[PDB]
């Protein structure tokens, strides 16, 4: 057969047309993320810089990241439904496995994880009134992209090689709540005791949420009439975006924004490698 | 047949023994809420009264309430699995419908919703170090009870009368996220614009979370060295539990604690009435 490229272009053409051929799973998710983007646009509309700014801006970010995480749970489905067709198409030998996996990842995951990221950023970014800079809009755009691919990558890494969607679905939901708690919002990651504060790093929405509130708090200011640079007899005040970040425990240096993305892409490569090894090890089990 | 009591005692004996006869759905949920109670006990262990106290205490409460809400999603199952046995047992006429419904509610819902409430309160209430008063422990106990029965009541009200668990499951998950946002944590309910701030009241974890942070913040204090009664040149400080409650928008008067429970029990009676009317209207459809 053909070596590498023509077969992934051809199988990616098949499943890509299959996604274009099925408006149900596509357009259902598209209208959900559009109307959900509108509702988050309505509730949080025009984020003020009052005292109530911080917990409102850090609210919506904690929604979106975590939204993307469970919006990856549908990506459990894509390797489990066609599993009999996968093993039948491998025992006949239609393809190479890396060509299959990199092809199917081009078909469903790469475009469908792009759409709610760009739709969310474009319709909630200006209703909410986040930072008017264009690059910050790009960092939010790309950040929701990466956290969608990484949560989806974990969904593939756990999902691939099983016949039942439901047990992997419950197992993914349990690991996403145990990663939900270790985001910045719900525990204050600094004051965990040290013998289990190490496992912050296994949490994907800390990477997403930490980036999305790194690029968006960093210039801000949150107490009207209080300049709060060298703040005096308000201590305890949390009247910048810096003080909320450091008090949250996030590297205010510009590398601390992008190490979230390197940790993201590292989790993408490791998780897809785990799914890849599951396919090479279960391809002959069949 | 017997009028009212012997038949609900007898059917409640049947399904109650059926729950004792099935260790899977019972003891699986029991070990999940025990080990999850332990993990929340470990992460938040010894809640300090530093600056980081508030968002940590208001973290765990927002978990538990919301946990109970999706821990009610399993209660979608209990009227949909036995639906063919329900319609077959009604066309034969084994029982009265109010005797069936009040009997089955005694069988599964009333004991199984008691257990993760009392287990959660007893194992996380002293690891975390919430208020040492015994009545506050009782209000948390009863509050998690009521929010479990009410979220489960909504799960019955949507669930009853359908054959497919999954569409009602997705529909319940969507209404629980849209009630999640309108809790106190994630939006600051005061600063919603008035044309959709009215629908706060349709949210069940506002009732649960509002009670659980009414009985638990109310005596507290959160800035070390700052007494903050008649607080001066810290404004903006949030150095009580009162200022977090009022700034969150919660009636600091003692009726404001219990109107959450009246709203709860009102939602229990209305939601179970809706499921009851669904059973009387679908009992002959069959």
């Amino acid at each position, epitope marked *: 057969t053909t070596s590498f490229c023509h077969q992934l272009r051809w199988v990616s053409k098949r499943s890509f047309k299959n996604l274009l051929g099925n408006p149900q799973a596509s357009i259902a998710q598209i209208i959900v993320t559009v109307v959900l983007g509108l509702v988050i646009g309505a509730i949080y509309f025009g984020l003020k810089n009052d005292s109530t700014g911080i917990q409102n801006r850090a609210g919506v970010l904690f929604f979106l990241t975590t939204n993307q995480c469970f919006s990856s749970v549908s990506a459990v489905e894509l390797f489990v439904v066609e599993k009999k067709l996968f093993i039948h198409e491998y025992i006949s030998g239609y393809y190479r496995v890396s060509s299959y996996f990199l092809g199917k990842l081009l078909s469903d995951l790469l475009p469908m994880r792009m759409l709610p990221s760009i739709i969310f950023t474009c319709i909630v970014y200006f209703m909410l009134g986040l930072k008017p800079k264009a690059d910050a809009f790009f960092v939010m755009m790309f950040t929701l992209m990466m956290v969608a691919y990484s949560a989806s990558s974990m969904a593939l890494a756990i999902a691939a090689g099983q016949s039942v969607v439901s047990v992997a679905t419950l197992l993914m939901t349990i690991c996403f709540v145990f990663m939900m708690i270790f985001s910045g919002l719900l525990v204050n990651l600094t004051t965990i005791a040290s013998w289990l504060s190490w496992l912050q790093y296994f949490s994907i929405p800390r990477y997403g949420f930490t980036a999305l509130q790194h690029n968006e708090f960093l210039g801000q200011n949150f107490c009207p009439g209080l300049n709060a640079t060298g*703040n005096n007899p308000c201590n305890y005040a949390t009247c910048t975006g810096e*003080e909320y970040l450091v008090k949250q425990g996030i590297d*205010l240096s510009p590398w601390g924004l992008w190490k979230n993305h390197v940790a993201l892409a590292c989790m993408i490569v490791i998780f897809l490698t785990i799914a890849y090894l599951k396919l090479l090890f279960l391809k002959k089990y069949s | 047949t017997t009028s009212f009591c012997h038949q609900l005692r007898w059917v409640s004996k049947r399904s109650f023994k059926n729950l004792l006869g099935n260790p899977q759905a019972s003891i699986a949920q029991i070990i999940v809420t025990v080990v999850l109670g332990l993990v929340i006990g470990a992460i938040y262990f010894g809640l300090k009264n*530093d600056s980081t106290g508030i968002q940590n205490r208001a973290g765990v409460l927002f978990f538990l309430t919301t946990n109970q809400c999706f821990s009610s999603v399993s209660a979608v199952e209990l009227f949909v699995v036995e639906k063919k046995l329900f319609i077959h047992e009604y066309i034969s006429g084994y029982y009265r419908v109010s005797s069936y419904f009040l009997g089955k509610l005694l069988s599964d819902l009333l004991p199984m919703r008691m257990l993760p409430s009392i287990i959660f309160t007893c194992i996380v209430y002293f690891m975390l170090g919430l208020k040492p008063k015994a009545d506050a422990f009782f209000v948390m106990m009863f509050t998690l009870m009521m929010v479990a029965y009410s979220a489960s009541s909504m799960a019955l009200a949507i669930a009853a009368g359908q054959s497919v668990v999954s569409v009602a499951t997705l529909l319940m998950t969507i209404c629980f996220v849209f009630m999640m946002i309108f809790s106190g944590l994630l939006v600051n309910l005061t600063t919603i614009a008035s044309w959709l701030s009215w629908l706060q009241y349709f949210s069940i974890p506002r009732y649960g979370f509002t009670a659980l942070q009414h009985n638990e913040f109310l005596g507290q204090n959160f800035c*070390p060295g700052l007494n903050a009664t008649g607080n001066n040149p810290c404004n903006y400080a949030t150095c009580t539990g009162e200022e977090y409650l009022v700034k969150q928008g919660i009636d600091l008067s003692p009726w404001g604690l219990w109107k959450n429970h009246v709203a709860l029990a009102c939602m229990i009676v209305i939601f179970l009435t809706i499921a009851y009317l669904k059973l009387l209207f679908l009992k002959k459809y069959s």
Partner: antibody
Amino acid sequence: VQLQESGPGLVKPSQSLSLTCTVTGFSITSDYAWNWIRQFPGKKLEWMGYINFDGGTTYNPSLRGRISITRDTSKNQFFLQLRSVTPEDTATYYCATFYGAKGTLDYWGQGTSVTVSS
Amino acid sequence: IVLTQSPSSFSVSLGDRVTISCKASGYILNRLAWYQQKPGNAPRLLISGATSLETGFPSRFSGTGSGKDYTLSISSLQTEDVGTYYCQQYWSTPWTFGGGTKLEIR
């Protein structure tokens, strides 16, 4: 505020030592948080721990299980006891007064040397 | 969070400007007090909030810097200002001080 602590000038090793910082000027339960700070022979400093006005305590996590700070509200006193001492803990000790909304240890005791010796 | 106050000694003559640089290990965000310990006394508070100054001082003292670098700067270093100066973060418990800097007279 005017602070003055007083106690022994010695303790045997592997015992406990107690000090008392009599406070005149405020009440211990009125406003500030109340604090203990050692100082090694020579230069180095080490914040030990505060009991605030409402009786909650916070201790330097190097000194786990070994320090305890108590409160006697009527005489305006607050006490340290340091259990299982070591001749390392030969140090000048200080009681100091932490404002909270300014953040800085504004007032300090005058100081007493404590020598763990055999 | 450990501070790192380097160097621990200076020998600058009278009436001069001298510069002390406290370097944190994380961000401490202007939560940095300077203390001014004499020989034989308790550390008196000198600079609160890393810019301001407690009343009762000759106002020749100037705390600058942000990020992680902080700096006490003394214009016209007098006789009284020899001592040991301890930076002290108070961003988070435990409140580690610095190693101190013993000034000297030329």
